[PDB]
Design a protein around this ligand. Structure first.
Ligand SMILES: C[C@H](CCC(=O)NCCC[N+](C)(C)CCCS(=O)(=O)[O-])[C@H]1CC[C@H]2[C@@H]3[C@H](O)C[C@@H]4C[C@H](O)CC[C@]4(C)[C@H]3C[C@H](O)[C@]12C
Ligand SMILES: C[C@H](CCC(=O)NCCC[N+](C)(C)CCCS(=O)(=O)[O-])[C@H]1CC[C@H]2[C@@H]3[C@H](O)C[C@@H]4C[C@H](O)CC[C@]4(C)[C@H]3C[C@H](O)[C@]12C
Ligand SMILES: C[C@H](CCC(=O)NCCC[N+](C)(C)CCCS(=O)(=O)[O-])[C@H]1CC[C@H]2[C@@H]3[C@H](O)C[C@@H]4C[C@H](O)CC[C@]4(C)[C@H]3C[C@H](O)[C@]12C
Ligand SMILES: C[C@H](CCC(=O)NCCC[N+](C)(C)CCCS(=O)(=O)[O-])[C@H]1CC[C@H]2[C@@H]3[C@H](O)C[C@@H]4C[C@H](O)CC[C@]4(C)[C@H]3C[C@H](O)[C@]12C
Ligand SMILES: C[C@H](CCC(=O)NCCC[N+](C)(C)CCCS(=O)(=O)[O-])[C@H]1CC[C@H]2[C@@H]3[C@H](O)C[C@@H]4C[C@H](O)CC[C@]4(C)[C@H]3C[C@H](O)[C@]12C
Ligand SMILES: C[S@@+](CC[C@H](N)C(=O)[O-])C[C@H]1O[C@@H](n2cnc3c(N)ncnc32)[C@H](O)[C@@H]1O
Ligand SMILES: C[C@@]1(C(=O)O)N[C@H](C(=O)O)C[Se]1
Ligand code: SF4
Ligand SMILES: [Cl-]
Length: 346
């Protein structure tokens, strides 16, 4: 019964069978109660502040060929771009002027920058007195070490799927073992480390989603980014089904229940598949939002998936828009860098 599963989640009996049953029950009453539980856990543990991370997608060049991603190297039907270091630093400064207290630098796996141009950019942004998060993919230990010495605070490296077989099929340049090794290296180097997965990948099962949740709980990640798979027409997965919004929202809710003190974004992908999806997600366990701060004319070229929101407006609209969102949700903007604030428990 749904009531017994909720009771077990409330008492922290996080077994495989409790998680499977939570993800398998489709009853509206149960789902609503689950979302209420996650919302309440979020409020009790991380409060009403919603942390704003301004994202600059500074290059859409990529050396990898992931089957799901519109930036894959085999996609010839995409104009490739690279922002200059000066452009990236000055765009970061504009975000800080607008009130961002974290800058996220995200790109394809673009060799050009690596490692020294990134280090130089990071040092300049750090002078502005904000947190810096990198989301650049898989690189050698030495690059991660350089970037930590340069001052980077956090690294986002979604694990994508914790099924090694599926991982290798979808990401044929690499492996789950490599992805995990990168995540473990990032943790050892002292980064606040983010992981997370897509929901609704072709071939992915409910038991695979359970394994994503257990993986996340095992490693105690500081941040967890979850969204639906969204098929991209210039990829091998073009004709596959999009991930289900409700199922993905349940994964976000369970992540908060499992990791009550973690930082969990309401991802752009959630707002792409359903109008108002980020707002829903902020009320079902999430406590972070990542407004797009990539300048025109580049923003519209960072086409990981189609239909991405925030492209038709002026490039400075997103930070004000999320501040309005936070207010209409009855929430508060973050007052500090929004680093993880651990609550040690039993
Ligand atoms: C309570 C009012 C008025 C009912 C009436 O006409 N009086 C009705 C009118 C439209 C309804 C919503 C929509 O259906 C969309 C959505 C469907 C889900 O299934 C359940 C949640 C949700 C948000 C609904 C909730 C509620 O039910 C609404 C606000
Ligand atoms: C806004 C809509 C519809 C509410 C509604 O329209 N209900 C009838 C009127 C009720 N009023 C009290 C305003 C008047 C009553 C007198 S009246 O004479 O109208 O009947 C309600 C219906 C179900 C609600 C969600 C679920 O909980 C799950 C979840 C829990 C989290 O924690 C917060 C997020 C989330 C997604 C919820 C958000 C929101 O809250 C929802 C969509
Ligand atoms: C960038 C320009 C020119 C002046 C400038 O370069 N200003 C640097 C401010 C740096 N900080 C954000 C760190 C100040 C924090 C002050 S605070 O007292 O909020 O802690 C300034 C002038 C007016 C400022 C907007 C308005 O105000 C309204 C609103 C308030 C929100 O809040 C943040 C968003 C928004 C849209 C503001 C953004 C930005 O800022 C604006 C455009
Ligand atoms: C109205 C749109 C469909 C729009 C469209 O594309 N048509 C559908 C798609 C996803 C649906 C939500 C999720 O199910 C999660 C949650 C379940 C609760 O039970 C009721 C509240 C809530 C927020 C649902 C409301 C509504 O039903 C949504 C937004
Ligand atoms: C400038 C645009 C339009 C409007 C829309 C929503 C407004 C914000 C919210 O009201 C919440 C909050 C209230 C505090 O009072 C002052 C700070 C802050 C962040 C507001 C600043 C500014 O006013 C915003 C961005
Ligand atoms: C575009 S990559 C950029 C950073 C770095 N290259 C990496 O892969 O970690 C950022 C994330 O986009 C997500 N993503 C890629 N293609 C997607 C798609 N078709 N649907 C939804 N999310 C997608 C993946 O989960 C990936 O971790
Ligand atoms: C920034 C990011 C995240 O969760 O950290 N969200 C992105 C999105 O949903 O478009 C894909 Se990676
Ligand atoms: S998911 Fe990251 S590594 Fe894979 S193709 Fe897209 S940008 Fe490149
Ligand atoms: Cl961050």
């Amino acid at each position: 019964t749904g009531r017994e599963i909720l009771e077990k989640l409330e008492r922290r009996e996080f077994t495989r069978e409790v998680l499977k049953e939570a993800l398998s029950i489709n009853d509206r009453g149960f789902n609503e109660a689950l979302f209420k539980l996650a919302d309440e856990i979020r409020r009790k543990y991380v409060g009403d502040e919603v942390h704003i991370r301004a994202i600059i997608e500074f290059s859409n060049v990529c050396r990898k060929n992931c089957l799901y991603c519109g930036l894959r190297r085999d996609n010839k039907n995409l104009k490739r771009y690279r922002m200059t270091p000066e452009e990236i630093v000055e765009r970061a400064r504009l975000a800080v002027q607008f009130g961002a207290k974290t800058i996220v630098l995200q790109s394809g796996e673009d060799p050009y920058x690596m490692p020294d141009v990134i280090s130089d950019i990071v040092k300049e942004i750090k002078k502005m007195g904000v947190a810096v998060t990198l989301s650049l993919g898989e690189w050698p230990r030495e690059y991660y070490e350089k970037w930590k010495e340069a001052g980077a605070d956090r690294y986002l490296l979604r694990h994508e799927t914790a099924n090694p077989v599926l991982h290798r099929k979808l990401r044929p340049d690499t492996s789950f073992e490599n992805r995990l090794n990168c995540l473990l290296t990032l943790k050892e180097l002292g980064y606040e480390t983010g992981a997370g997965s897509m929901v609704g990948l072709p071939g992915q099962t409910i038991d695979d989603l359970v394994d994503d949740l257990l993986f996340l709980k095992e490693h105690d990640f500081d941040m967890v980014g979850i969204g639906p798979f969204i098929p991209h027409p210039d990829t091998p997965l073009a004709n596959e089904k999009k991930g289900d919004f409700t199922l993905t929202l349940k994964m976000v809710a369970l992540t908060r229940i499992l990791l009550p003190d973690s930082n969990i974004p309401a991802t752009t992908a959630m707002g792409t598949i359903v109008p108002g999806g980020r707002e829903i997600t902020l009320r079902c366990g999430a406590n972070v939002i990542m407004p797009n701060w990539t300048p025109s004319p580049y923003r519209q070229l960072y086409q990981l998936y189609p239909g991405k929101i925030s492209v038709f407006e002026k490039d400075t609209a997103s930070i004000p828009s999320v501040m309005k969102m936070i207010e209409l949700l009855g929430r508060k903007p973050g007052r500090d860098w929004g680093g993880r604030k651990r609550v040690f428990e039993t």
